[PDB]
Design an enzyme around this catalytic site. Structure first.
Site, PDB file in Angstrom:
ATOM      1  N   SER A 125      -3.194   7.731  57.042  1.00  0.00           N
ATOM      2  CA  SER A 125      -4.542   7.240  57.295  1.00  0.00           C
ATOM      3  C   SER A 125      -4.416   6.042  58.213  1.00  0.00           C
ATOM      4  O   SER A 125      -3.602   5.151  57.976  1.00  0.00           O
ATOM      5  CB  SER A 125      -5.202   6.887  55.977  1.00  0.00           C
ATOM      6  OG  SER A 125      -5.196   7.996  55.100  1.00  0.00           O
ATOM      7  N   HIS A 185       0.019  -0.388  47.708  1.00  0.00           N
ATOM      8  CA  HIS A 185      -0.308  -1.147  48.909  1.00  0.00           C
ATOM      9  C   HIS A 185      -0.175  -2.631  48.581  1.00  0.00           C
ATOM     10  O   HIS A 185      -0.981  -3.453  48.983  1.00  0.00           O
ATOM     11  CB  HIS A 185      -1.738  -0.815  49.385  1.00  0.00           C
ATOM     12  CG  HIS A 185      -1.639   0.502  50.119  1.00  0.00           C
ATOM     13  ND1 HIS A 185      -1.508   1.691  49.423  1.00  0.00           N
ATOM     14  CD2 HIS A 185      -1.559   0.807  51.424  1.00  0.00           C
ATOM     15  CE1 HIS A 185      -1.387   2.689  50.281  1.00  0.00           C
ATOM     16  NE2 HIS A 185      -1.432   2.174  51.499  1.00  0.00           N
ATOM     17  N   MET A 234      -1.215   0.294  57.818  1.00  0.00           N
ATOM     18  CA  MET A 234      -0.256   0.509  58.890  1.00  0.00           C
ATOM     19  C   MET A 234      -0.665  -0.194  60.191  1.00  0.00           C
ATOM     20  O   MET A 234       0.148  -0.814  60.861  1.00  0.00           O
ATOM     21  CB  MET A 234      -0.089   1.996  59.200  1.00  0.00           C
ATOM     22  CG  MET A 234       0.988   2.625  58.349  1.00  0.00           C
ATOM     23  SD  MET A 234       1.400   4.261  58.999  1.00  0.00           S
ATOM     24  CE  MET A 234      -0.099   5.169  58.727  1.00  0.00           C
TER      25      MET A 234
HETATM   26  C1  LIG Z   1       2.467   6.590  49.004  1.00  0.00           C
HETATM   27  C2  LIG Z   1       2.001   5.700  50.129  1.00  0.00           C
HETATM   28  C3  LIG Z   1       0.950   6.084  50.904  1.00  0.00           C
HETATM   29  C4  LIG Z   1       0.534   5.225  51.922  1.00  0.00           C
HETATM   30  N1  LIG Z   1      -0.465   5.690  52.726  1.00  0.00           N
HETATM   31  C5  LIG Z   1      -0.811   4.938  53.744  1.00  0.00           C
HETATM   32  C6  LIG Z   1      -1.790   5.459  54.680  1.00  0.00           C
HETATM   33  O1  LIG Z   1      -2.309   6.525  54.482  1.00  0.00           O
HETATM   34  N2  LIG Z   1      -2.109   4.658  55.717  1.00  0.00           N
HETATM   35  C7  LIG Z   1      -1.497   3.400  55.918  1.00  0.00           C
HETATM   36  O2  LIG Z   1      -1.863   2.786  56.858  1.00  0.00           O
HETATM   37  N3  LIG Z   1      -0.554   2.943  55.108  1.00  0.00           N
HETATM   38  C8  LIG Z   1      -0.218   3.659  54.032  1.00  0.00           C
HETATM   39  N4  LIG Z   1       0.762   3.236  53.235  1.00  0.00           N
HETATM   40  C9  LIG Z   1       1.224   1.852  53.440  1.00  0.00           C
HETATM   41  C10 LIG Z   1       2.347   1.776  54.485  1.00  0.00           C
HETATM   42  O3  LIG Z   1       3.161   2.945  54.481  1.00  0.00           O
HETATM   43  C11 LIG Z   1       3.164   0.577  53.989  1.00  0.00           C
HETATM   44  O4  LIG Z   1       2.246  -0.500  53.853  1.00  0.00           O
HETATM   45  C12 LIG Z   1       4.080   0.133  55.109  1.00  0.00           C
HETATM   46  O5  LIG Z   1       5.035   1.152  55.453  1.00  0.00           O
HETATM   47  C13 LIG Z   1       4.775  -1.131  54.555  1.00  0.00           C
HETATM   48  O6  LIG Z   1       5.735  -1.575  55.725  1.00  0.00           O
HETATM   49  P1  LIG Z   1       6.874  -2.589  55.414  1.00  0.00           P
HETATM   50  O7  LIG Z   1       7.566  -2.794  56.716  1.00  0.00           O
HETATM   51  O8  LIG Z   1       6.283  -3.612  54.632  1.00  0.00           O
HETATM   52  O9  LIG Z   1       7.713  -1.882  54.381  1.00  0.00           O
HETATM   53  P2  LIG Z   1       8.345  -0.399  54.320  1.00  0.00           P
HETATM   54  O10 LIG Z   1       7.876   0.417  55.331  1.00  0.00           O
HETATM   55  O11 LIG Z   1       8.332   0.030  52.932  1.00  0.00           O
HETATM   56  O12 LIG Z   1       9.811  -0.574  54.637  1.00  0.00           O
HETATM   57  C14 LIG Z   1      10.724  -1.334  53.794  1.00  0.00           C
HETATM   58  C15 LIG Z   1      12.091  -0.734  54.123  1.00  0.00           C
HETATM   59  O13 LIG Z   1      13.130  -1.554  53.484  1.00  0.00           O
HETATM   60  C16 LIG Z   1      14.102  -0.599  52.952  1.00  0.00           C
HETATM   61  N5  LIG Z   1      14.708  -1.412  51.900  1.00  0.00           N
HETATM   62  C17 LIG Z   1      14.242  -1.623  50.644  1.00  0.00           C
HETATM   63  N6  LIG Z   1      15.041  -2.455  49.993  1.00  0.00           N
HETATM   64  C18 LIG Z   1      16.031  -2.786  50.864  1.00  0.00           C
HETATM   65  C19 LIG Z   1      17.199  -3.655  50.761  1.00  0.00           C
HETATM   66  N7  LIG Z   1      17.468  -4.360  49.693  1.00  0.00           N
HETATM   67  N8  LIG Z   1      17.935  -3.716  51.883  1.00  0.00           N
HETATM   68  C20 LIG Z   1      17.682  -3.033  53.018  1.00  0.00           C
HETATM   69  N9  LIG Z   1      16.638  -2.224  53.197  1.00  0.00           N
HETATM   70  C21 LIG Z   1      15.858  -2.136  52.102  1.00  0.00           C
HETATM   71  C22 LIG Z   1      13.260   0.523  52.434  1.00  0.00           C
HETATM   72  O14 LIG Z   1      14.149   1.591  52.317  1.00  0.00           O
HETATM   73  C23 LIG Z   1      12.329   0.714  53.631  1.00  0.00           C
HETATM   74  O15 LIG Z   1      12.774   1.545  54.651  1.00  0.00           O
HETATM   75  C24 LIG Z   1       1.184   3.998  52.150  1.00  0.00           C
HETATM   76  C25 LIG Z   1       2.270   3.618  51.392  1.00  0.00           C
HETATM   77  C26 LIG Z   1       2.656   4.449  50.357  1.00  0.00           C
HETATM   78  C27 LIG Z   1       3.818   3.996  49.500  1.00  0.00           C
END
Ligand SMILES: Cc1cc2nc3c(=O)[nH]c(=O)nc-3n(C[C@H](O)[C@H](O)[C@H](O)COP(=O)(O)OP(=O)(O)OC[C@H]3O[C@@H](n4cnc5c(N)ncnc54)[C@H](O)[C@@H]3O)c2cc1C
Ligand SMILES: *[C@@H]1O[C@H](CO)[C@@H](O[C@@H]2O[C@H](CO)[C@@H](O[C@@H]3O[C@H](CO)[C@@H](O)[C@H](O[C@H]4O[C@H](CO)[C@@H](O)[C@H](O)[C@@H]4O[C@H]4O[C@H](CO)[C@@H](O)[C@H](O)[C@@H]4O)[C@@H]3O)[C@H](O)[C@H]2NC(C)=O)[C@H](O)[C@H]1NC(C)=O
Ligand SMILES: *[C@@H]1O[C@H](CO)[C@@H](O[C@@H]2O[C@H](CO)[C@@H](O[C@@H]3O[C@H](CO)[C@@H](O)[C@H](O[C@H]4O[C@H](CO)[C@@H](O)[C@H](O)[C@@H]4O[C@H]4O[C@H](CO)[C@@H](O)[C@H](O)[C@@H]4O)[C@@H]3O)[C@H](O)[C@H]2NC(C)=O)[C@H](O)[C@H]1NC(C)=O
Ligand SMILES: Cc1cc2nc3c(=O)[nH]c(=O)nc-3n(C[C@H](O)[C@H](O)[C@H](O)COP(=O)(O)OP(=O)(O)OC[C@H]3O[C@@H](n4cnc5c(N)ncnc54)[C@H](O)[C@@H]3O)c2cc1C
Ligand SMILES: *[C@@H]1O[C@H](CO)[C@@H](O[C@@H]2O[C@H](CO)[C@@H](O)[C@H](O)[C@H]2NC(C)=O)[C@H](O)[C@H]1NC(C)=O
Ligand SMILES: *[C@@H]1O[C@H](CO)[C@@H](O[C@@H]2O[C@H](CO)[C@@H](O)[C@H](O)[C@H]2NC(C)=O)[C@H](O)[C@H]1NC(C)=O
Ligand SMILES: *[C@@H]1O[C@H](CO)[C@@H](O)[C@H](O)[C@H]1NC(C)=O
Ligand SMILES: *[C@@H]1O[C@H](CO)[C@@H](O)[C@H](O)[C@H]1NC(C)=O
Ligand SMILES: *[C@@H]1O[C@H](CO)[C@@H](O)[C@H](O)[C@H]1NC(C)=O
Ligand SMILES: *[C@@H]1O[C@H](CO)[C@@H](O)[C@H](O)[C@H]1NC(C)=O
Lengths: 587, 587
Positions: free
Chosen positions: B114, B520, B565
């Protein structure tokens, strides 16, 4: 409990997969859990046998209290030592989590340490009903005693309710057993529970290692003299990890078995292991590949390797090598909790286990429950097969008749009511003998994605739901009955969530919503005759294959009215002997 | 969807920790998720900047349909690509699972695709209220547009309910966006829902990328022209993985940040990473360590490194380096589902989102809800702080007033009702603007055990529960109302589980038992002024430290009425610019 000295075993083990990639061992053991390490230890007593154990996790026995102290049970859940497998959405429309250990020692790292043994008739049925020659109580009793070194209870432990039948405990084995004793005054509730059920004519203080676990008793735990959890790594790896012929690769997963085609079927020649579809290595076995990855995973490794039901394999896009009823017949138990506050007088430590038979569990509903067992087996077998819990109705009927025999003719414990005190009258309880059969299957071809449908199919058999409801009602009834009433200070669970006069029907509804897996799934690679739907034979060899065995908790063909460590250690020792017999027969 | 031939990026990435151990990079990014990869790509545009991304998982973007096809959403749950973090037992006494991606692209690998943007007033408040200079809608709008390459909807997509305000869509960016179109006939239910709410005076077909997401619209997805999920690895790593200055270590976890003590505080000099307490390595950063491990993990990494609340660190046996309110203020949303069967005429594909404001959500209970907001903020703030969701009542009241302002004065969407069709009228819905504040803290000192207490504290704030109950009732009410009624073929969830005339109070009880995290969670390392309880400043630098930033979903100081996102990409781009500004200032 005192955090003593722990050898850093991990730093002497392998964690670099390139150190084993493409090498050739005699045996490769997938999974360094209870059975995997036991067998590894037994195989490597022979210096000419080079064994590789590939374990997903690491050495965790030196983690401190969270692992070492039995009283910290449950705190490890959710950590990296918890596999935390997800089931499919269950009957209550929620997925559930499967606790399983990830690390050397497997689930022995995170379990409740309860050390009890199955009923003689249950193990005898492995040979007598399932055709597994040599798998009978007399043989298994010996192997189970060989695995343990029991300490007799102290005076206070005996006074609390312990009862030790010295003829049933091994004193020279590897896994120490003895009464859990956390240093606290002993709760009087274990005795109160015994007095309550003994007034009902229920056996008390039967030693649960002796072959007929019945009534209310306090139990042994697999704890050393320092009250330290004797997980399988501590028992079997800690003493033996310096053997040059024992190589332990940690942090890596076996994804599939590698085979070569022979006139007499696929012959396992090694495994593919690693952490990802593009980060994996082949490693070879001169003799055999032994799957010991746990009942949730060993069936999957077979399926990823092309051994399993065609319907499953086709859906997963895995080329079928061999059609075998892998990943069906799976039997886990449903656990519910009935918890009440204990009065201040009931404070203190102590656990007691009530192995309730059929009539004790069902009480006034016994006649009705008996009628169901006597008339619905065929129907249940048909329905279980129809939902994919098994594939041969006739063969499943055999299992059902076996369970019926146990329950109605052999006075086998039907439900286990596990009582914890520590200020409460907490019952964790489960119907031990499920009629449901679940399945555990891969959903796609990449082993490293670990995409599976783990479906214990809890309560899809009406008897299991009734059994759990009745056991749950029993726990509530027992709590404010006889001598127990003195220490009863109000039910908290279900508490207000279920009326105190709840009928069996209301309990059924409650239980359906408020149960958890017992996390004791067995029979996902059933050791039984091929005609009965077995996956492995009496020496744990996968039918139709050479050089491949499943040696873990996937193989027991039945559930047991007991905590399984004892029988799994005995089973692992028996299987090790079979492997060694074969080894000797190849020169 | 059509499986195309994918590049095996994994084979060109690092999976051997010994290849990076002891090296020095300019930047080390912990976590190769949405923000980590975006920043890594931006930083490595400069060929002289050497960046190491340490990612727990692997490259998964070529896993086929389970990842690539948006319509396979949810099949990945439970696989190795699903972190499947466990929360503490929530308000309903059940632990819950947190879905989070594990692999390059993080949660973008497994999410719903989304693609919507927050309300202008919410982003403006980061600067105006939280004091984060430059974090306002106008700036973030530009950054969000720069991240994307939108496709205009086709005629059929427009006729189905799509509507585009072309001024809000970037057309030259990295992440493609466009209408999901799985090739099936379009369900007429999206239009029926719009016609239903438009009769009630609710806005319809507002472009949710334009700054005031309100009413019922169809939305963009982050899908390329092949309808392939554009996860962050596909968008930012696939095109750039051959960069010699971009090193990706997969399969490894960053456990803690290594610091050198300076006059101006702790200076991050690198990280300890690996897979176990005895299998870990150090790698150094000449410039900065950037935490991007996700909102559930980045705060833990700080805490494992000694940065966090004393009470938490003491309990975990971690020596405190810096006292900062890490791991509190966490805000996830609660999701409930109201599902109804659709008639055959309602068949077809299509999702529609209702961004319901305060009055639309509460309906007749609006006055009562408004009274709560006007009178209970101080009480709620005290109660939230008391339960450990935050540490400063006055600062929390600022957040509460900000939220109240959004809801009551700015017409900000309060609840999101996400409708899926495909044969059903399925509403996944969540109160977007929680008053509860949760916490996420380590429980012990070994990072590789990952023993934490992830506690979103769902429904510990009465308004959140009320809000979720009202939204859920609204979803039921909308389903059988106006034009929707035509397609209504009976509720299945709650269905018989909740009376059809359920009051708000009955809905509350229902919602309490049947909710899930929305996954989220933000604000676990809030980007807000230090005085307001911030953990990172406007450049994402951890207060009181040098060379350390938290750049992921942990940092947004508020929830947003949107899928994150878009804003996270915008945020990551802005943070990359801030990092590069500092890089430039060091010669
Ligand atoms: C089920 C679900 C559905 C979603 N649907 C939507 C949607 O429809 N639209 C939208 O906009 N957003 C959506 N989101 C939200 C979006 O995907 C997340 O908010 C976004 O990816 C968060 O980005 P980030 O960089 O914070 O973390 P993430 O993308 O989670 O990345 C964190 C990364 O760190 C890695 N990691 C974890 N611990 C460690 C460690 N100790 N050392 C090294 N690496 C590590 C993980 O493997 C991962 O790859 C959804 C999320 C989920 C869980
Ligand atoms: C989440 O889990 C928590 C923890 O388990 C749940 O909170 C507990 O909820 C239980 C109730 O379900 C509650 O137990 C009550 O404690 C009271 C003391 O504060 C007792 O007075 C009360 O006892 C009465 O009820 C019992 C259950 O029916 C009887 O067994 C008992 O004999 C008592 O009955 C007398 O009093 C009642 C008055 O209600 C009267 O109607 C009877 O006829 C009779 O006269 C319970 O034991 C715990 O105190 C709660 N808290 C904790 C921390 O344990 C919570 O409910 C769960 N949430 C969800 C959503 O399930
Ligand atoms: C686990 O989840 C599964 C799947 O969701 C649950 O199984 C579904 O359960 C729902 C009921 O909760 C059931 O839906 C009914 O389907 C019937 C057709 O098979 C419909 O006839 C029925 O509609 C009536 O009830 C609805 C809900 O109240 C109303 O919205 C609807 O208008 C209908 O009500 C009218 O009709 C009746 C008489 O017909 C009248 O008395 C009413 O007042 C009114 O006039 C529901 O839609 C699904 O069929 C079930 N199965 C599947 C596969 O979806 C299961 O219950 C869950 N398990 C647990 C333990 O929770
Ligand atoms: C919560 C819980 C409580 C329990 N309580 C009790 C109790 O109180 N008393 C009792 O007697 N028993 C108890 N048990 C049961 C007992 O612990 C298990 O029956 C026993 O450990 C199963 O042994 P195993 O060899 O089959 O499998 P496990 O011990 O689970 O070992 C399997 C091993 O395989 C590893 N592995 C998994 N996948 C792979 C792969 N692909 N490649 C390589 N390695 C892999 C796992 O990390 C693990 O170490 C409990 C179990 C659980 C989960
Ligand atoms: C289950 O164990 C009970 C003992 O608890 C067996 O004995 C009967 O117990 C019930 C109630 O507990 C009494 O009504 C009977 O009178 C007991 N029998 C005698 C001879 O007194 C019972 O046989 C066991 N059930 C099975 C199926 O074996
Ligand atoms: C929530 O949105 C509703 C629309 O569903 C808003 O109601 C409209 O508000 C405008 C004023 O800005 C009036 O001109 C319309 O007549 C209103 N009426 C209705 C019921 O449609 C409502 O103001 C919004 N609520 C908040 C708190 O902003
Ligand atoms: C003692 O153990 C023997 C087996 O050695 C068994 O036959 C007998 O029933 C046991 N008695 C009790 C009370 O446990
Ligand atoms: C089904 O199981 C029964 C009992 O083991 C067996 O006799 C029969 O051979 C099995 N059917 C087939 C076709 O295998
Ligand atoms: C169109 O988008 C612009 C932003 O680019 C916004 O200011 C305007 O309000 C939008 N129009 C509508 C009708 O939403
Ligand atoms: C509490 O927060 C308020 C609002 O930001 C601030 O004025 C006060 O300084 C804060 N904290 C402390 C340390 O008192």
């Amino acid at each position: 409990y005192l955090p003593a000295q722990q050898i850093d075993v991990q730093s002497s083990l392998l964690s670099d997969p390139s150190k084993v990639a493409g090498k050739t061992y005699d045996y490769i053991i997938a999974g360094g859990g209870l059975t995997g390490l036991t067998v590894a230890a037994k195989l490597t007593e022979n210096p000419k046998i080079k064994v590789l154990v590939i374990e997903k996790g690491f050495y965790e026995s030196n983690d401190g209290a969270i692992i070492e102290d039995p009283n910290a049970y449950g705190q490890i859940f959710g950590t990296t030592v918890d596999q935390n497998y997800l089931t499919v959405p269950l009957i209550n429309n929620r997925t559930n989590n499967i606790k399983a250990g990830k690390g050397l020692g497997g689930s022995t790292l995170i379990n409740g340490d309860s050390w009890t043994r199955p009923d003689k008739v249950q193990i005898d049925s492995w040979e007598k009903v399932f055709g597994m020659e040599g798998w009978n109580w007399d043989n298994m009793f010996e192997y189970m005693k060989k695995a343990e070194a029991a300490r007799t209870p102290t005076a206070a432990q005996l006074a609390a309710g312990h009862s030790f039948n010295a003829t049933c405990h091994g004193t020279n084995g590897t896994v120490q057993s003895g009464a859990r004793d956390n240093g606290q005054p002993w709760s009087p509730i274990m005795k109160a529970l015994m007095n309550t059920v003994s007034a009902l004519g229920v056996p008390v203080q039967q030693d649960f290692l002796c072959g007929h676990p019945r009534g209310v008793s306090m139990i042994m735990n697999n704890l050393d003299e320092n009250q330290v959890r004797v997980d399988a790594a501590r028992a079997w790896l800690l003493p033996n990890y310096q053997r040059s012929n024992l190589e332990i690769l940690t942090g890596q997963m076996v994804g599939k078995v590698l085979f070569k085609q022979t006139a007499s079927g696929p012959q396992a020649v090694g495994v593919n292991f690693g952490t990802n579809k593009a980060v994996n290595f082949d490693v070879f076995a001169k003799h055999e590949v032994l799957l010991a990855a746990g009942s949730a995973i060993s069936p999957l490794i077979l399926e990823y390797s092309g051994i399993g039901l065609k319907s499953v394999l086709d859906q997963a896009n895995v080329t079928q090598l061999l059609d075998l009823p892998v990943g069906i017949n799976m039997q886990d138990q449903t656990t519910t909790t009935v918890s009440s506050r204990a009065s201040s007088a009931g404070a203190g430590q102590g656990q007691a286990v009530f192995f309730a038979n059929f009539t004790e569990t069902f009480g006034d509903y016994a006649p009705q429950a008996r009628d169901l067992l006597n008339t619905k087996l065929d129907q249940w077998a048909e329905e279980t097969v129809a939902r994919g819990g098994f594939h041969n109705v006739t063969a499943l009927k055999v299992q059902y008749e076996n369970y019926r025999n146990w329950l109605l003719d052999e006075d086998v414990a039907f439900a286990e009511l596990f009582m914890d005190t520590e200020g409460k009258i907490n019952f964790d309880l489960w119907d031990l003998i499920p009629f449901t059969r679940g399945s555990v299957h891969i959903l796609s071809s990449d082993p490293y994605l670990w995409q599976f449908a783990n479906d214990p199919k809890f309560f899809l058999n009406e008897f299991d739901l009734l059994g759990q409801a009745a056991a749950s009602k029993l726990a509530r009834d027992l709590t404010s009955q006889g001598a127990m009433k003195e220490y009863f200070a109000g039910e908290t669970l279900p508490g207000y969530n279920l009326v105190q006069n709840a009928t069996l029907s209301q309990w059924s509804d409650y239980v359906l919503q408020n149960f958890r897996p017992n996390w004791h799934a067995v029979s996902s690679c059933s050791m039984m005759s091929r005609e009965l739907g077995g996956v492995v034979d009496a020496t744990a060899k996968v039918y139709g294959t050479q050089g491949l065995r499943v040696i873990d908790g996937s193989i027991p063909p039945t559930q047991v009215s007991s905590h399984v460590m004892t029988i799994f250690y005995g089973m692992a020792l028996k299987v090790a002997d079979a492997i060694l017999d074969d080894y000797a027969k190849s020169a």
